[PDB]
Amino acid sequence: TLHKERRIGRLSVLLLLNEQVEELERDGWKVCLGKVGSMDAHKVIAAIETASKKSGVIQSEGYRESHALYHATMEALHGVTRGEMLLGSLLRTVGLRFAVLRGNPYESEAEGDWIAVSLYGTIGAPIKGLEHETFGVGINHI
Amino acid sequence: TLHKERRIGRLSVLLLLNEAQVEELERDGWKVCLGKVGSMDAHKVIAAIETASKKSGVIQSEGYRESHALYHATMEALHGVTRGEMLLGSLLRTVGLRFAVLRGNPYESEAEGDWIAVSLYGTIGAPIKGLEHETFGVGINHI
Amino acid sequence: TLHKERRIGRLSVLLLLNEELERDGWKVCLGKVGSMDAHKVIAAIETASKKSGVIQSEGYRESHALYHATMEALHGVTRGEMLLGSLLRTVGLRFAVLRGNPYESEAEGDWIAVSLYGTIGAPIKGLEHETFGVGINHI
Amino acid sequence: TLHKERRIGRLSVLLLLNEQVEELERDGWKVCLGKVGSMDAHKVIAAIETASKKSGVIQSEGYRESHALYHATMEALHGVTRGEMLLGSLLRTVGLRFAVLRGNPYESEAEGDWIAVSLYGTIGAPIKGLEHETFGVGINHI
Amino acid sequence: TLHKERRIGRLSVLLLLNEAQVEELERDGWKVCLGKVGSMDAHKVIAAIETASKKSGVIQSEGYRESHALYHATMEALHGVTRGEMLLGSLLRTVGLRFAVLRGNPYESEAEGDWIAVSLYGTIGAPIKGLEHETFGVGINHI
Amino acid sequence: TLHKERRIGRLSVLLLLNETQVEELERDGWKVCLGKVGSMDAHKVIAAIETASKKSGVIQSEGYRESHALYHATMEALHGVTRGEMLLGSLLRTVGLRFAVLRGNPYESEAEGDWIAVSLYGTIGAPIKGLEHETFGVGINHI
Numbered sequence: 001t002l003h004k005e006r007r008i009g010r011l012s013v014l015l016l017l018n019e020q021v022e023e024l025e026r027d028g029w030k031v032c033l034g035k036v037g038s039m040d041a042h043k044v045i046a047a048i049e050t051a052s053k054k055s056g057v058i059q060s061e062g063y064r065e066s067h068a069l070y071h072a073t074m075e076a077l078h079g080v081t082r083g084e085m086l087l088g089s090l091l092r093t094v095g096l097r098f099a100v101l102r103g104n105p106y107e108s109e110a111e112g113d114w115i116a117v118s119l120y121g122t123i124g125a126p127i128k129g130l131e132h133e134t135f136g137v138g139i140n141h142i
Numbered sequence: 143t144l145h146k147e148r149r150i151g152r153l154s155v156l157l158l159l160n161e162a163q164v165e166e167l168e169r170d171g172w173k174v175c176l177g178k179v180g181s182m183d184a185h186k187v188i189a190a191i192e193t194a195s196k197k198s199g200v201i202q203s204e205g206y207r208e209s210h211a212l213y214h215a216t217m218e219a220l221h222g223v224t225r226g227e228m229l230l231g232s233l234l235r236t237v238g239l240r241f242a243v244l245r246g247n248p249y250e251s252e253a254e255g256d257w258i259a260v261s262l263y264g265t266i267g268a269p270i271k272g273l274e275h276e277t278f279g280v281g282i283n284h285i
Numbered sequence: 286t287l288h289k290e291r292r293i294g295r296l297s298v299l300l301l302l303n304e305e306l307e308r309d310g311w312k313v314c315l316g317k318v319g320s321m322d323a324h325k326v327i328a329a330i331e332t333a334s335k336k337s338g339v340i341q342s343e344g345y346r347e348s349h350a351l352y353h354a355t356m357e358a359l360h361g362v363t364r365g366e367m368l369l370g371s372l373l374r375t376v377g378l379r380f381a382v383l384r385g386n387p388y389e390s391e392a393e394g395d396w397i398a399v400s401l402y403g404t405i406g407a408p409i410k411g412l413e414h415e416t417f418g419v420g421i422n423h424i
Numbered sequence: 425t426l427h428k429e430r431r432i433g434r435l436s437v438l439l440l441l442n443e444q445v446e447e448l449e450r451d452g453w454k455v456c457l458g459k460v461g462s463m464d465a466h467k468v469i470a471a472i473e474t475a476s477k478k479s480g481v482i483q484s485e486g487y488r489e490s491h492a493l494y495h496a497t498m499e500a501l502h503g504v505t506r507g508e509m510l511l512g513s514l515l516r517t518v519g520l521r522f523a524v525l526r527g528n529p530y531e532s533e534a535e536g537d538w539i540a541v542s543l544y545g546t547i548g549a550p551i552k553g554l555e556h557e558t559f560g561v562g563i564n565h566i
Numbered sequence: 567t568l569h570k571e572r573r574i575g576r577l578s579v580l581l582l583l584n585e586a587q588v589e590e591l592e593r594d595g596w597k598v599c600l601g602k603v604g605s606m607d608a609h610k611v612i613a614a615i616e617t618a619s620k621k622s623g624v625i626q627s628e629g630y631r632e633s634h635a636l637y638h639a640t641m642e643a644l645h646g647v648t649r650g651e652m653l654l655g656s657l658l659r660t661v662g663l664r665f666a667v668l669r670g671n672p673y674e675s676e677a678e679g680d681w682i683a684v685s686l687y688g689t690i691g692a693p694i695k696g697l698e699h700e701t702f703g704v705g706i707n708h709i
Numbered sequence: 710t711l712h713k714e715r716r717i718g719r720l721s722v723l724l725l726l727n728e729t730q731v732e733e734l735e736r737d738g739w740k741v742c743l744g745k746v747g748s749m750d751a752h753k754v755i756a757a758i759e760t761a762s763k764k765s766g767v768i769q770s771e772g773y774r775e776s777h778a779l780y781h782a783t784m785e786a787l788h789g790v791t792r793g794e795m796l797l798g799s800l801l802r803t804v805g806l807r808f809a810v811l812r813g814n815p816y817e818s819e820a821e822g823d824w825i826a827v828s829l830y831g832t833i834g835a836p837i838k839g840l841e842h843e844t845f846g847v848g849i850n851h852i
């Protein structure tokens with residue numbers, strides 16, 4: 001399994017809801033931090049893609065490391081969208097802080113890099129004030 | 143709006159993720175409940191939670207109103223865990239899950255009433271040994 | 286165009302809510318089924334429509350149409366995930382299946398409507414609310 | 425328990441299916457009816473929100489009652505959309521009427537107010553005539 | 567049941583896969599149609615297929631019946647392509663597809679009437695140049 | 710992008726829809742695997758395929774990494790087969806499938822590594838077999 005004190009999701013989460021970047025970077029973690037506000041999902045997917053190539057998290061060349069992040073993002077959007085992966089076209093909108101990790105979370109080195117996308121903030125109507133919290137975490141091999 | 147000290151999702155999740163705790167949250171005006179469930183049946187996960195939340199009186203043991211908000215909240219969170227098909231065993235996967243239910247008012251205006259949050263953390267994977275990754279789910283509903 | 290006097294959905298639903306159509310063009314059946322299993326709800330509907338003359342007992346064409354229309358109806362009932370006991374909820378349903386042509390165009394042929402009405406909730410009565418679904422297909 | 429003389433779903437569906445006399449107002453029900461045609465699901469949501477707010481079905485102030493109605497409409501749209509909550513985006517359009525009811529349908533007054541969203545009308549191709557009926561009913565506590 | 571040579575599903579997929587049979591299909595009694603379409607909108611794909619299917623007389627241009635069948639068989643085929651959420655552009659992705667639409671009776675029993683298959687093949691990936699893997703999708707309806 | 714005459718989907722698919730030729734694929738860089746499963750449980754379909762890809766050389770039997778890709782590539786292929794709800798028996802339908810599994814690199818450079826393709830073909834229909842129609846699904850993941 002994974003290590004009792006280096007569980008990548010639990011980290012990516014504990015970080016996102018606590019103001020950090022430094023202690024984690026000192027271990028194997030290629031970390032990334034973010035914020036997107038949109039009523040389009042294709043917007044959130046694009047932001048995350050950029051911040052991930054922009055900081056050290058994902059190789060900008062090729063499809064491989066990309067394809068990992070796309071599906072890891074979808075997955076996180078699930079917890080967020082809770083059933084239909086739609087925002088504005090369902091008359092809703094999001095204020096999100098995204099956190100993204102990469103490193104090996106398992107005991108054996110043969111396990112390679114794994115990517116975690118965490119998403120936290122709020123979902124509600126286009127008019128600010130009308131919202132509750134939302135939450136999505138996704139995990140893929142990279 | 144959501145008052146920054148009382149972000150109900152955030153509190154409930156922080157609670158689950160930290161080994162160390164409840165007693166502090168009760169003092170502020172929070173009904174609280176924790177537990178564990180491991181299963182290949184999503185129904186056992188729902189049931190354990192409906193159970194824990196009633197024995198420890200986060201919601202009433204009788205009536206329907208409160209059971210309904212909790213059902214829909216659990217359903218919501220199980221979205222995080224399952225990511226597209228709310229199935230475990232029938233898609234050959236299983237979960238080892240801690241959960242928290244957290245009840246109070248996260249809104250500045252005290253005429254917003256109570257709200258419920260249900261959070262789920264643990265692993266999801268194949269039935270074999272340690273063939274799994276982490277998994278997570280939060281669901282919020284007016285109660 | 287839908288012939289406003291003969292709307293196969295509206296009719297099938299009104300039927301479920303009340304406690305005739307055969308003399309107009311309609312083939313009609315009604316039934317009851319309570320389950321923690323969706324497959325049984327599907328099966329009860331299939332069986333009841335075959336016992337009466339709503340869809341022919343033989344071949345696949347008419348069965349396939351009833352299959353899908355039932356599914357579409359279950360979408361109304363289940364509201365995101367087409368699962369019952371499997372998510373610790375349960376159903377007590379009446380159903381109707383109507384068949385006949387709702388369009389002016391007599392070219393349009395027979396259509397099917399599958400309507401589902403009842404309650405969905407916890408295993409325990411009263412810990413439940415109402416539930417509805419309609420599925421419409423060509424046949 | 426649900427009392428046969430007051431099934432909120434049943435009533436809203438009956439009202440919507442007939443052709444003006446109120447007398448549902450005569451008991452404790454708050455009610456409205458509407459018409460809306462769109463190829464946009466968000467427009468449908470907005471209409472029903474607006475119409476319930478421009479009468480006194482749900483309060484225009486605060487998040488709670490907006491939230492319940494939001495969700496009831498989402499549920500209701502399931503029956504209508506049957507799998508993907510997409511309209512013009514999947515090349516289809518709706519002609520709907522709708523009714524929203526709010527009241528205590530349970531014997532025990534402890535149950536408080538519940539809401540029901542009913543939708544009836546057509547779904548078909550962007551041309552009128554190429555369409556069939558469609559129905560969604562959502563029920564939530566409020 | 568279906569026969570070994572007149573299995574509509576496969577034939578229609580197989581047709582798409584050899585860039586090389588259309589006439590060979592027609593001498594048998596299949597009514598068939600080949601196409602290509604690229605887009606970031608799901609609706610465009612449906613349109614492409616609806617149009618080509620009416621223009622070359624796979625289905626009646628007049629009336630609803632045959633349209634309704636087509637629509638749902640396309641709906642089905644798009645699940646394979648889209649694998650969970652039936653969005654393209656609105657979920658940051660786009661498609662290049664050939665499509666085939668086949669009509670006739672894949673059964674001994676001739677009282678089954680006509681059935682219809684819609685097969686889609688191309689790729690899927692980002693709007694960007696060359697980020698793409700393959701994609702697939704078959705829908706089957708009575709017609 | 711892709712090398713045009715080693716497109717992993719079409720290969721596995723042509724492979725699957727064609728009743729030796731394994732060896733042809735094997736003689737290039739392909740790890741390749743075939744098999745058959747009929748079930749009213751999706752989990753049996755996933756399981757058969759995990760086992761067949763492990764018994765042959767197709768994926769490493771030790772660890773999680775390769776299983777997670779194969780798990781997911783399968784989910785994706787079953788989306789094609791099942792079309793909205795990834796349920797068989799609990800929706801009173803059943804499958805008789807045949808499956809192909811391909812592994813290797815089908816892109817320009819070899820920095821792209823291995824990718825996997827799980828391709829499904831067969832029928833779906835009522836628990837009384839015979840009353841059926843065809844089915845198809847293709848899942849593509851990196852490995």
Ligand SMILES: N[C@@H](Cc1c[nH]c[nH+]1)C(=O)O
Binds near residue numbers: 091092123130490491
């Ligand atoms: N737009 C929704 C936001 C939402 C609630 N639940 C999930 N999303 C609202 O108006 O509240």
Ligand SMILES: N[C@@H](Cc1c[nH]c[nH+]1)C(=O)O
Binds near residue numbers: 776
């Ligand atoms: N049985 C699956 C469970 C799973 C993986 N990813 C998401 N769920 C597995 O092989 O791990």
Ligand SMILES: N[C@@H](Cc1c[nH]c[nH+]1)C(=O)O
Binds near residue numbers: 213373405
């Ligand atoms: N278990 C839920 C069932 C349900 C509510 N809404 C839809 N289904 C309940 O007990 O009410």
Ligand SMILES: N[C@@H](Cc1c[nH]c[nH+]1)C(=O)O
Binds near residue numbers: 515550637
């Ligand atoms: N766009 C579809 C409408 C539809 C049928 N079923 C659900 N929607 C049509 O052209 O008929």
Ligand SMILES: N[C@@H](Cc1c[nH]c[nH+]1)C(=O)O
Binds near residue numbers: 659699
């Ligand atoms: N945005 C994704 C699209 C996708 C991957 N898998 C399914 N869809 C990509 O870069 O290819």
Ligand SMILES: N[C@@H](Cc1c[nH]c[nH+]1)C(=O)O
Binds near residue numbers: 349
């Ligand atoms: N049980 C369905 C199976 C099915 C048909 N189409 C999709 N699934 C049937 O009777 O054929």
Ligand SMILES: [Zn+2]
Binds near residue numbers: 071699849
């Ligand atoms: Zn992909």
Ligand SMILES: [Zn+2]
Binds near residue numbers: 132283491
């Ligand atoms: Zn909500």
Ligand SMILES: [Zn+2]
Binds near residue numbers: 349706842
């Ligand atoms: Zn079918």
Ligand SMILES: [Zn+2]
Binds near residue numbers: 210414
């Ligand atoms: Zn409910």
Ligand SMILES: [Zn+2]
Binds near residue numbers: 421556634
């Ligand atoms: Zn339709």
Ligand SMILES: [Zn+2]
Binds near residue numbers: 139275777781
């Ligand atoms: Zn996974």
